[PDB]
Paper text:
Acylpeptide hydrolase (APEH) or acylaminoacyl‐peptidase (AAP) is a serine hydrolase that regulates protein metabolism. It can also bind to and process unusual substrates, acting as a detoxifier. The most prominent physiological function of APEH is the removal of N‐acetylated amino acids from the N‐terminus of oligopeptides and proteins (Perrier et al., 2005) thereby exerting crucial control over the proteasomal degradation of damaged and misfolded proteins (Adibekian et al., 2011; Hoernstein et al., 2023; Hwang et al., 2010; Palmieri et al., 2011; Sandomenico et al., 2021; Shimizu et al., 2003; Shimizu et al., 2004; Tangri et al., 2021). The S9 serine protease subfamily, the so‐called oligopeptidases, employs a further, size‐based selection process (Kobayashi & Smith, 1987). Their active site is sequestered in an inner pocket that is formed between the catalytic hydrolase domain and a propeller domain that caps it.
The pAPEH—dimethoxy‐phosphate (DMP) complex was created by adding dichlorvos (DDVP), an organophosphate insecticide, to pAPEH. The structure of the complex was determined by cryo‐EM to 2.65 Å maximal resolution, in D2 symmetry. Dimethoxy‐phosphate (DMP) residue of dichlorvos is bound covalently to the active Ser587 (Oγ‐P1) of APEH. The free oxygen of the phosphate (P1‐O1 moiety) is fixed and oriented by the oxyanion site. Here—in contrast to the pAPEH‐AcAMHK complex—one H‐bond is actually formed with the oxyanion‐loop (with the amide NH of Gly509), while the other interaction partner (the amide NH of His588) is still too far for a strong association. One of the methoxy groups is positioned within the S1 binding pocket. Compared to ligand‐free pAPEH, the shift of the oxyanion‐ and the His‐loops can be seen: the oxyanion‐loop moves closer to the inhibitor with the backbone N and Cα of Gly509 shifting by 0.6 and 0.7 Å, respectively, in similar way to that seen in the pAPEH‐AcAMHK complex, however, the catalytic His‐loop moved in the opposite direction (by 0.8 Å measured between His707(Cα)s), shifting away from the catalytic center. We found DMP bound in a non‐aged form—meaning that it retains both of its methoxy substituents. Aging is the spontaneous dealkylation process that often occurs in organophosphates bound to serine proteases, where the gradual loss of the O‐alkyl (or N‐alkyl) groups increases the irreversibly bound nature of the complex. On the other hand, surprisingly, through this very same sensitivity toward the OPs, APEH has also become a potential target for cognitive enhancing drugs promoting synaptic plasticity and learning in young brains (García‐Rojo et al., 2017; Sandoval et al., 2012). Both developing sensitive and specific monitoring systems and attempting to design nontoxic but effective inhibitors of APEH require a precise understanding of the mode and requirements of the binding process—the structure of the pAPEH‐OP complex presented here can be utilized toward these goals.
Author numbering:
A (entry chain C), B (entry chain A): 9 to 109, 117 to 182, 199 to 495, 498 to 730
C (entry chain B): 587 to 730
D (entry chain B): 148 to 182
C-alpha cells in the first residue's frame, strides 16, 4: 500500500549525514584544564520543501594532553545557505568563505564581525569559481595575508555583425565551441590559479603554467615563495574526469613572480592528492602507474623538499599483504593526514567488504590497522590535528555516528580509545552477514587462479517462513559495496524482503589481480559469478525460490539485462536505471570512449578508426543479443540529460521488448542527468521501484 | 572630499549590533564543574551586497552557583537567512523556528536533526504569520506538546462576474476595502490565535475572542487550561499602533474549548507586556492610565492567579523618586524578567540622559538601581534565567559590548560583578559630556515651575581653535537621547564637528510633569528651549559662532523649520527628513489624527468636524507661517511611501522657498516609507547630508 | 545534411580538387546514426536492406553500413573545413559532426566548428541563420 | 501543416479543428493536502 511505503520512506530518510569537520585552537583556563572545539557539517533531505539542507553544529572536548576527559554539545543546530567553500586560517583566528548570494562573494570573518568582503564578479578578472572536488581549492598563506583559489579562464568579448552602436569585441565569434570536462562538469573548460591580497584587494592570475595543462589542487610552498599544483593534460582532447583516476597528470611548482614551471614527478602516469607535512619539509601523494582501468590500486609516494629525492612508501598489493591490508583504493587523502611529529600518515581504505583506518610510518614502511577485528563496519576519517582524530562510524543497521580519539604513540596504534559525540538509534529489525564464494573450476582463467569473492546478506531478524529476495550487483565495474548505512536496502529489508549485494571478481579492495582479471571478459564472467552466488544462497538459506528480483544501475543494470536474457526462468521482476545496452553504438556518443575499448579487450588510442573486428567483438558482448528471449516484466528509469550513458541505450531495449508485447514500464526525467540526485526525482524513482517489486512479488 | 567620507563611513558602519540572547540548560561534569551555553544574535550592514545580515554566535560560561569562574567563546559565527521567529523549549531540548523560504514553514529541531516541518501555506487555515513586535508571539506548552502563535484571519474567496468556468466564491467582492493598522503594518487587519499540535499536525483557530478586538502577546495559562492574551480595540476604526502606547486595550483569558472570554483588568486604560512568574502563581504587566499623550510614565501592576486580587507595585513618579529613579518609560519587558524565587523583577529604563537597570521587589515595593554612579552609559537587559543576567553596554565613544552577571541576594543588588564576553575597541578621538540647563523665568508656566532640561555635547579630543557645531533636537516629541552608541554623531565628531543633542522639556525620563508640560504649547516653548541651549553653549564653550548648523527629522524637522524661520541670522545650513509643515492639512491625511488634536491643545473625539477655531489654532502653530523669512540653504529628504507624515508637507515648503529663489536641494525616495531604513537609502542620505554640511560650513 | 555527406565523400576521395568546405549538420557514420535518429528506416533503405520492426544488429548489415560512410576516408582529408551544428537536432544527432571534428583535429588539420545550443535542424532562427551565412561567406572569401 | 486544419460547416454554424488529447492529472506521493 502506497501510504505505508511513504510513511516508511519519510521515517528512513529522516536520518542526517555527516560531511565535514574541523578543529579549533587550544585553550587553557586559569584553573588548569584544557579544552577545544569541534565543528561539524551535516546534510539532510527535506521532503516538504524538496531540498538538501545543510547545517553546522559544534561540540566541546576537555582533554589532558593524551586522554579525553569530557565531551559535550555546545549549542543548537544552525542552517546555512549559499556556502560553496570555507577554510579556517592556520592559526584559527579568521575564516574565509565563498558565498553565492546571482553573484559570488569572498568573505573574511573574525570574532563577531565580517572583517572583509569582495565582489569577485564586479572585478571582472575571471569566470565562475570552481567549487567541485576535482579542481576546487581554497588555501591560506603561511603569513595569513593572501588567499589562493582556482577560477574559470576569461573569454574575449564577442558581438554579432548586425549590432547597432550608440550614435573591442570580435564579431561573429559568440557561438564558438569550448570543450568541457564531461559529466557534471558542464561549462568547465580551462581553470586558472588566482591569488588575492586581503590588505589591498587586488586579484592576480599567475603566469607560467603550461599552455596545455589544467591546474588544480594547489597549496602554498614552504616560505610562501611559490605555489604547488597538479596539472591534468587536456591534449589533444578532454576525457571524462568523474570517478576516473587513470587521467594523465603531473605535479608542478611555480614561483609567484613570472617564471618557468618546474616538474617534481614523472610525466607518464597519474598523480593526485598532495599533502604538505606540518614541519614544511616533505610532501606525500598518490600515484597510479597504469591508465588502462578507471580504478585500481595506487602507490604512496614521498618527496623531500630539500634533498629533492623521491621514494615509494606503500607499493602495489597483488592479492593481500598480511591479513589486514589489501592496498590503497581511495582517491583523496584527508586535508589533515599528518601526525604531529611529521612521521606518520593516517588514512582509510576498503578491506574486503568493510572499510578500515590505517596508519603508515614513512620511515620504515609498515602499515598498521587501527580498527582490525570485530564484526565489521564502515569508518571514515575526517581530520587529524595534533594527534586528535575525528571519525564517522556506520553499519547496515545503524545510521552514521560521530567519534573522536587520540592517536597512540608509535608502535601502539592497536589500542586507540574512542569517545562518542553523537550516537544514533539502531534498528534491531535488520540483520546482516557476509558470505564468501569460491568460483567453480570451470569459471577460472589460468592467469589468475584461486580468486574468490563475497556478498552481503541482509534479512529481517525474528521471522516466523519463505521469504522473497532482491539481488543487487554494483556499478563500476571497479567498485564495491561496504558494510555501511544504505537507505534503500534498509527499506527493502524493513518491508519484508531479503537483500543480497554481490561483490563479483573485479571489485576494489581484493587486490590488483582481481582488478586486472575482469577487463576483456565482461559479459560472461561476472554474470556467471552473480548466478553462482544466487544459486548458492538459495540452496543454503532456504529462501523462496519462486520470488527473486533483480535491481541495478549503470554497469549493474548492464549485468541485470544479461541475466534476464540468459536465465529467463529464474527472476520475476527487474528494475534498471540508465543501463548500458549496446557498446558499439555507445562508443561514439559517451564522454569516456576509452571505457568501451578497455572493457571490450582492446587498447584505446587517439585517432582510432572503426574496424570490423572491434565492432563484432563489441556487439558480441552486449545484452541486446539476448533481447528476443526476455520474459520478465521490466521497469526502466532514464535521465534525459545524461552525458556518461546516453539515454537512447534504454530506448532501443524498450522498443525491442515492446515490439513483442512484453510488460514494460518506462519513466523519463527531462532534467536529471545521471544519478537522479534531485530529491523529487530520487523519491519518485524509489517509490516506483518499491511499488513495482511489491506488486509483482 | 567624497572619498575620505566614504572610507570613514565604511569604517564606522563596520560595527555590528546585538539583538537577542538566550540561555541553555545547566550541565554537570564528572569532575564536578558546572557550565552552560549562551546564544546571541548579531546584525550588521554589508555595503557590497547592500543588506542587513544576521548571524548567531555562542559562548560558554563555567560557574560555581553564585560566581562566574570562566567565560569563553565556543566557535565561529554562522550567517542565517529567512528566520522570522524562534523560541527554545522550556526544558531546552527542542527549538521551534519560523522560516520564509515564497511560503512559510514551521520547523521543530532537536539535537542534530530537523525533527518536524509543517507547510502552513498548504494547510490553508489562515493568512501570513505576524512576525512583528506588537502582535507577534510564539509560545510553547508546559507539556511541550503544542505551539501557539498569531496569524492573519482568512478571507472568503471572490471572483469577477465575467470569469469563464470549466465545461463557492462571492462575485464582485475582490476589491473590498480592508483597513490596516497604519505605518509599517500594511495588509495587517485582523489577527487570530492559532494552536498547532506537534504530534498529529492539526491546526486550530481558537473561538471565543470578542468580535471587536485584535488579540496579541499571548501565552499559555497555568496548567495548559487556556490562553492569556491582550486585546486591542479596533472600533469604530483603527489608529496608528507604532510608537504609541495610548491605544485602548485589555487583558483576557479564554479556555481551549469553546467558551466565553474572561476579563482580568479594567477596560478603560492601556495595558501591555504581561509576564508569568516561574512558579506559575502571579502575573505582572504595564498599565498606562491616560490616552492623551503617545508616550508617558507607566505603572507596574500585579495580578494573583488564585486570589484574583490586583495591586500596584510601582506607581507614577511626578518629578523624581529619590535620586536614581524617574519612572518606567519603556514599552516592553524582557521575555525573561523574573528572578528565581519569583519575588523580584528586573528591567531597564531611561534615567535623565542615561539608561539604567532597576530591580523591584513585588512584596515591599522598593526600587533599587544596579548601575548607579559612574560617568554614564547605556545598558540593555536581554534575559535572566536562574539569576543569570545577560546585558549589553555601550557609550557614545564605545560600540556595543556584551556582559553577563549574577544577581546578588535580596538587599545587596548594589554589588553586582560583571564579566566581559565580547568587548569593543574604543575611539579615543571622541569626548562627550552632559550639560544641565535651567530655563529663564519668562519661559515658565505657573502650573509646572522649576523644571530643567539637558544636552549631550560631543567634541573632538585634543584639538589645537574655532570649531563648527551641529545641533540636533529629537523627534517625538515624547522621546529622548541617551548616552549610547550613535553612528552619525560619531562620524560628524570624527570629521571635525562638535555635536549638540538637545533634550528639551517634554522628553521621557524626567518625570510626568515634563511629559504633561509640552502639550498645547508646541511651537514656542521647545523652540525657545533649543535657542537658549544653543546660546548658552556658544557663550560658554567658546565655539565658532559663525558656523552653526541644524539637523532633525519628523518633529525635529518641525523644530528646525521654526528655528530657521524665527531666527534667520543664526544658522548657516539645515538638513531635514520627512518634516511636519502644516498641521491643519496633515490632520486629514495621517494615520494618527489624534496627534494633531492633542498637540494643538484640544481633545480628540471620533465623529469630529472642522471648526474655525481649531483650524486657526492649528495654522497659527505651523512653521509655514514663517516661510517668507527663511534665508538659510536647505536640504530636504522625503520618502514617497510614508504613511505617518505624508510627503506633500515637504513639497509645500519646497515650493514656497523655491518661488523666492532660495538655495534648496530636494531628494525623493520612491520606496522608502518613513525611516529610510534601507541600506542604500540610508547610506545615500547620510552621505548627502555630510557633503552638504561640509560644503556650506 | 545529405549534402554534407556528399561533400565529405568528395573531399575525402578527391583531396586535390577543392580548397575549402562548409557543412551544416552532416551525416558521418550511418551505423551509429541508425540507433539514435527518429527515422531509422532511412538508413536501412539507403544501405540496401529492407526495414522491419523488431530488427536486430547483424554483422553483414553493420559492415555494409560502415563501408558506405565518409569516415572511412578521414585519414586522407586535406582541405580546410567549417562545421555548423545544432545541438537540439533530432533528425541527425550532432555527435556525427563531433566524430569527424575529433578525427580531423587529431591530425592537425585546419578545422573551425560552431555549435548552436538551441537551433534544431534548419537553423531557421534569424540570428542563427544570419551568423551562419556570414561565417560561411567570410570563410570562403578568406580561403579563396 | 501535417495535422492542423480549421473547417467551417456548410450551414456556417459549427467549426472543426484538431487538438492534443487530454492527459489525466497526476501528483507526487509526498504532496500535502489542505486540512
Amino acid at each position: 500500500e502506497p501510504e505505508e511505503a511513504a510513511a516508511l520512506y519519510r521515517g528512513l530518510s529522516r536520518q542526517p549525514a555527516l560531511s565535514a569537520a574541523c578543529l579549533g585552537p587550544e585553550v587553557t583556563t586559569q584553573y588548569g584544564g584544557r579544552y577545544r572545539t569541534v565543528h561539524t557539517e551535516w546534510t539532510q533531505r527535506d521532503l516538504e520543501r524538496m531540498e538538501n539542507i545543510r547545517f553546522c553544529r559544534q561540540y566541546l572536548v576537555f582533554h589532558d594532553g593524551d586522554s579525553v576527559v569530557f565531551a559535550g554539545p555546545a549549542g543548537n543546530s544552525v542552517e546555512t545557505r549559499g556556502e560553496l567553500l570555507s577554510r579556517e586560517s592556520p592559526s584559527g583566528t579568521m575564516k574565509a568563505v565563498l558565498r553565492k548570494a546571482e553573484k559570488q562573494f569572498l568573505e573574511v570573518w573574525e570574532k563577531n564581525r565580517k572583517l572583509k568582503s569582495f565582489n569577485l564578479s564586479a572585478l571582472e578578472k575571471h569566470g565562475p569559481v570552481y567549487e567541485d572536488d576535482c579542481f576546487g581549492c581554497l588555501s591560506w598563506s603561511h603569513s595569513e595575508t593572501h588567499l589562493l583559489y582556482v577560477a574559470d579562464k576569461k573569454r574575449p568579448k564577442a558581438e554579432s555583425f548586425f549590432q547597432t552602436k550608440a550614435l573591442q569585441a570580435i564579431k561573429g565569434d559568440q557561438f564558438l565551441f569550448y570543450e568541457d570536462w564531461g559529466e557534471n562538469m558542464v561549462s568547465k573548460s580551462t581553470p586558472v590559479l588566482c591569488v588575492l591580497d586581503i590588505e589591498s584587494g587586488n586579484i592576480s592570475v599567475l603566469e607560467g603554467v603550461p599552455e596545455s595543462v589544467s591546474p588544480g589542487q594547489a597549496f602554498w610552498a614552504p616560505g610562501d615563495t611559490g605555489v604547488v599544483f597538479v596539472g591534468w593534460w587536456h591534449e589533444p582532447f578532454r576525457l571524462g574526469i568523474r570517478f576516473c583516476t587513470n587521467r594523465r597528470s603531473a605535479l608542478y611548482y611555480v614561483d609567484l613572480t613570472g617564471g618557468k614551471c618546474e616538474l617534481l614527478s614523472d610525466e607518464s602516469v597519474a598523480v593526485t592528492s598532495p599533502r604538505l607535512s606540518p614541519d614544511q619539509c616533505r610532501i606525500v601523494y598518490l600515484r597510479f602507474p597504469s591508465l588502462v582501468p578507471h580504478q585500481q590500486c595506487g602507490q604512496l609516494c614521498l618527496y623531500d623538499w630539500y634533498t629533492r629525492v623521491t621514494s615509494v612508501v606503500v607499493d602495489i598489493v597483488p592479492r593481500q599483504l598480511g591479513e589486514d591490508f589489501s592496498g590503497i583504493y581511495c582517491s583523496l587523502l584527508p586535508l589533515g593526514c599528518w601526525s604531529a611529529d611529521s612521521q606518520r600518515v593516517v588514512f582509510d581504505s576498503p578491506q574486503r567488504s568493510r572499510q578500515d583506518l590505517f596508519a603508515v610510518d614513512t620511515q620504515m614502511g609498515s602499515v598498521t590497522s587501527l580498527t582490525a577485528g570485530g564484526s565489521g563496519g564502515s569508518w571514515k576519517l575526517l581530520t587529524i590535528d595534533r594527534d586528535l582524530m575525528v571519525v564517522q562510524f556506520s553499519t547496515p543497521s545503524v545510521p552514521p555516528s560521530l567519534k573522536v580519539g587520540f592517536l597512540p604513540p608509535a608502535g601502539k596504534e592497536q589500542a586507540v580509545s574512542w569517545v562518542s559525540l553523537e550516537e544514533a538509534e539502531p534498528f534491531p529489525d535488520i540483520s546482516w552477514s557476509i558470505r564468501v564464494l569460491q568460483p567453480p573450476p570451470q569459471q577460472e582463467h589460468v592467469q589468475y587462479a584461486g580468486l574468490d569473492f563475497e556478498a552481503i546478506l541482509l534479512q529481517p531478524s525474528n521471522s516466523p517462513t519463505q521469504v522473497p529476495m532482491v539481488v543487487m550487483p554494483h556499478g563500476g565495474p571497479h567498485s564495491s559495496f561496504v558494510t555501511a548505512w544504505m537507505l534503500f536496502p534498509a527499506m527493502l529489508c524493513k518491508m519484508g524482503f531479503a537483500v543480497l549485494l554481490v561483490n563479483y571478481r573485479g571489485s576494489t579492495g581484493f587486490g590488483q589481480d582481481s582488478i586486472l582479471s575482469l577487463p576483456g571478459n565482461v559479459g560472461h564472467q561476472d554474470v556467471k559469478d552473480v548466478q553462482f552466488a544466487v544459486e548458492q544462497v538459495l540452496q543454503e538459506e532456504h529462501f523462496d525460490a519462486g520470488r527473486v528480483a533483480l535491481m541495478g544501475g549503470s554497469h549493474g543494470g548492464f549485468l541485470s539485462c544479461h541475466l534476464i536474457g540468459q536465465y529467463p526462468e529464474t527472476y520475476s521482476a527487474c528494475v534498471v536505471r540508465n543501463p548500458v545496452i549496446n557498446i558499439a553504438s555507445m562508443m561514439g556518443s559517451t564522454d569516456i570512449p576509452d571505457w568501451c575499448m578497455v572493457e571490450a579487450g582492446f587498447s584505446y588510442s587517439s585517432d582510432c578508426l572503426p574496424d570490423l573486428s572491434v565492432w563484432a567483438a563489441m556487439l558480441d558482448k552486449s545484452p541486446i543479443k539476448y533481447a528476443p528471449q526476455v520474459k520478465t516484466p521490466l521497469l526502466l528509469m532514464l535521465g534525459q540529460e545524461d552525458r556518461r550513458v546516453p539515454f537512447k541505450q534504454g530506448m532501443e531495449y524498450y522498443r525491442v521488448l515492446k515490439a513483442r508485447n512484453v510488460p514494460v514500464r518506462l519513466l523519463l526525467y527531462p532534467k536529471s542527468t545521471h544519478a537522479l540526485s534531485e530529491v523529487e526525482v530520487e523519491s519518485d524513482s524509489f517509490m516506483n521501484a518499491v511499488l513495482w517489486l511489491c506488486t509483482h512479488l
